[PDB]
């Protein structure tokens, strides 16, 4: 039994915008988290439906690592049963979520002083996202009964906004790389060291 490519997800070059989050699929490997010792010490770590240190001693069918960038004050929404424009139009965890959420400040990495307008989130959407759903379309959002069909105008709004990550900002406004481990329990193929 082999190790899991966690370092390949964190030490990864740059992350997707929250609206179009990455999901790397994980199967056939060993759950060693001390791999992560070295990074901006990755402080925010909370799990749901599972306990810490009961992890090296558990096995699940499949495991998913979702990754994206959001601003700090919006990290509280990456948790089951949240609301906010992120928890609703960008990335929704289910109410019964079992898994772990990890987030470190990436101000040193994704802030240009000119402004990093590469990180995007969906602002306008008719309805909430279903849990673990991804909306990629950049269709023009129809705010009026008068249809839009291409023209960005009154009651015709393009639905994504840049985050504008500047390093000056108060820490609420600073970028945060986030990785969400989904633990899904078919034969089991992802276990911890104490079960290798």
């Amino acid at each position, epitope marked *: 039994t082999n190790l899991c490519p966690f370092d390949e997800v964190f030490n990864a070059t740059r992350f997707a915008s929250v609206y179009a989050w990455n999901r790397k699929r994980i199967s056939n490997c060993v759950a060693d988290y001390s791999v992560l010792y070295n990074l901006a010490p990755f402080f925010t770590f909370k799990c749901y439906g599972v306990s810490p240190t009961k992890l090296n001693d558990l096995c699940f069918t499949n495991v998913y690592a979702d990754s994206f960038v959001i601003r700090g*004050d*919006e990290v509280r929404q990456i948790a089951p049963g949240q*609301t*906010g*424009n992120i928890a*609703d*139009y960008n990335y929704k965890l289910p109410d019964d979520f079992t898994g772990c959420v990890i987030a470190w400040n990436s101000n040193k990495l994704d802030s240009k002083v000119s*402004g990093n307008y590469n990180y995007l989130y969906r*602002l*306008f*959407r*008719k*309805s*909430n996202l279903k849990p673990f759903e991804r909306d990629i379309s950049t269709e023009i*959002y*129809q*705010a*009026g*009964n008068k249809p839009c069909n291409g023209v960005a105008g009154f*009651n015709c*709004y393009f639905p994504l*906004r840049s985050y*504008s990550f*500047r390093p*000056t*900002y*108060g820490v*609420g*406004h600073q970028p945060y790389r986030v990785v969400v481990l989904s633990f899904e329990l078919a034969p089991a193929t992802v276990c911890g060291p104490k079960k290798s």
Partner: antibody
Amino acid sequence: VQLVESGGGLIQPGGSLRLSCAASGFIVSRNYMNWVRQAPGKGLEWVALIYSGGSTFYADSVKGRFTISRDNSKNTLYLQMNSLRAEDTAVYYCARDLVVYGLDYWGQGTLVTVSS
Amino acid sequence: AIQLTQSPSSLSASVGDRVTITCRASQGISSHLAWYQQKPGKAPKLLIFAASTLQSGVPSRFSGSGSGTDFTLTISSLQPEDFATYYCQHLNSNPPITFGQGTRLEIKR
């Protein structure tokens, strides 16, 4: 083009009251909508917010007593007000919100006055 | 949360004068700020958003200026009708939106 509101008036302390603001030019079921109040000769104070996908948020001064609703059919937004304390006396404005572009359309005002 | 304070609170100025009201934030917010005009007995009117850009239907003598944590509304060719109370707002993506306490602008004649 237009946002027109109605439903305020006199009501005892502890009483209850339901404002309603109806829309022209845009469906409320598609927009972020807000209720902002203004005490007499005081400033502006944000009160509630409803997302296009229904997620609601309240200012603490009103949390658990107000409930901001809407009706997709009538194309109208509501603001149900219970446990009405006396400090709630103010003009109540509804407003359409384009979050990063500001509140571009506003209602005209309705005066909720809560006195015994 | 964030705090917005306007100066001055009151202000008298003569027709045609260039008047400048200022809005100071207790946190650097890039350009997420709107200026609102409220004539008495009326809802407020949006004048400026993105801290500098002019809303549609608004007279051009309104300078949206400032950036970072200090901003100014500058009306240049002051006019009799432009007597109102002027408010600034945090155009924030997360709920609790805040306005300044406002400036009362009185015309001198």
